[PDB]
Paper text:
The ganglioside-induced differentiation-associated protein 1 (GDAP1) is an integral MOM protein, proposed to have an auxiliary role in mitochondrial fission and fusion, possibly via redox-dependent interactions with cytoskeletal components.
The R120Q mutation is located close to the N-terminal end of the α3 helix. Due to the mutation, residue 120 loses contact with the α6-α7 loop tip at Cys240, whereby the hydrogen bond between the Arg120 side chain and the backbone carbonyl of Cys240 is lost. This is further linked to alterations in surrounding side chain conformations. Arg120 participates in a hydrogen bond network between helices α3 and α6. Structures of the mutants R120Q and R120W indicate loosening of the structure locally, as well as loss of the hydrogen bond, which is accompanied by a decrease in observed heat stability in R120Q and R120W. Arg120 is not conserved in GSTs at the sequence level; however, an Arg residue from the neighbouring helix in GST reaches the same position and makes similar interactions to the same carbonyl group in the ⍺6-⍺7 loop.
Residue numbers in the entry:
A (entry chain A), B (entry chain A): 23 to 165, 197 to 302
């Protein structure tokens, strides 16, 4: 009876993780996309999301939670009905710290800096989905927050190190799993918060053109298979199916 | 036409400052007291507000702001119509840094620790408005977050140092102002955010019984006069008139 209310930007990275957790836990929520199709500067969503997509908020009766991570933790702590799926093993579980490891590993990536650099240095991307004139608009507003190419190759190399860990664990998952069985996700048989972080963060790289550089075409094949699997997951397609199409707003 | 929506706890200290700023700036807002009269443990509001009153949230079209200070700053930055009163002098004003000084000075006081200590050590209070059995309930839930008396006399002495600065500035204000004229507030003729912090924070001390110790009865007479003035201010009485009566909820 107590309502579950959420305010957010449909295309905000933070919002996407939260909205996917709600769908995974089969929770009834009253979502409110406060984002508008056209900005004051007459701009669409794919022209604005740098730091302008900031922090959502969740309202559950007497509780008010804001940031993405803090909202997800609240949902996991609160809705404990037997019918509600758990996205984290028990707190005292043998397998718990491994899940929280990959979760914090992915949640620490500077996604705003990756978005900041894509629009500013397209040459480092492949098949970017942002129009090229976005690089023309943001750079005309000029006359670590700056456009140091070395700084991007640095964190992009840092990203490859993180994905090397993921490819390894997925490889570990692949060998342990018999074929014709139920293929596991990142940490185990079940879909966890680490998977929520992975699905959403890999989908953002595909939007920014940082996908061909990191997986596919022979590189990190287990990561490619993982990403092609979440795309078909029904909870992921319903909540994030169109968040990369620049034709919907 | 764009609506102004707020979620909060009526008795939360943070919420009170925000709601007083809205009233001072004559802003039309859609306030939503999410606090309930009776807790899950069958408790009223005056039994719960330690850290359970946490952070409000403001929703203005595409913007989502959370903490109290950040909300107040947003309101000051946004609503600039000539008819909207300003609670801060211009950013490049000669008198600006003095206002921001007293504001940050008051906003840094550990109000949650003062509330925490009152219920835990009534002996250090005078005319506390919390029922005495609140000390009986919270201490029965046991079997810096702890109940070190020296730690409270420490920060209470720190509080007196802050109020000594306020009494001095109000004294300075008194001497400069001719009698029969318009009596000024803390920083000047106009009601500022520093006054919003002062009015709400002094009203909380009166609720916790830390008023007789700090002003009145001959002590800090300018502070006593200030507090008796805000009580009659129509914007203050409409928004905070009943927030100390334990009979309303």
């Amino acid at each position: 009876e107590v309502k579950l209310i959420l305010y957010h930007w449909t295309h905000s990275f933070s919002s996407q993780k939260v909205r996917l957790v709600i769908a995974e836990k089969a929770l009834k929520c009253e979502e409110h996309d406060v984002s508008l199709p056209l900005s004051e500067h007459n701009e669409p969503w794919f022209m604005r999301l740098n730091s302008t997509g900031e922090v959502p908020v969740l309202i559950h009766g007497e509780n008010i939670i804001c940031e993405a991570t803090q909202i997800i933790d609240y949902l996991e702590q609160t809705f404990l009905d037997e019918r509600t799926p758990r996205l984290m093993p028990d707190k005292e579980s043998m397998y718990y710290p491994q899940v929280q490891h990959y979760r914090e590993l992915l949640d620490s990536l500077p996604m705003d800096a990756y978005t900041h650099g894509c629009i500013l240095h397209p040459e480092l991307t492949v098949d970017s989905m942002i129009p090229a004139y976005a690089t023309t608009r943001i750079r005309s507003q000029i006359g670590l927050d700056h456009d140091n190419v070395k700084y991007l190759k640095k964190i992009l190399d840092e990203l490859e190190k993180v994905l090397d860990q993921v490819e390894t664990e997925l490889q570990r998952r692949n060998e342990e799993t018999p074929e014709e069985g139920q293929q596991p996700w990142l940490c185990g048989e079940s879909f966890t918060l680490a998977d929520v972080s992975l699905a959403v963060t890999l989908h953002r790289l595909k939007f920014l053109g940082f996908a061909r550089r990191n997986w596919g075409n022979g590189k990190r094949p287990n990561l490619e298979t993982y990403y092609e699997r979440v795309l078909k997951r029904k909870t992921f397609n319903k909540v994030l199916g169109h968040v990369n199409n620049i034709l919907i707003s």
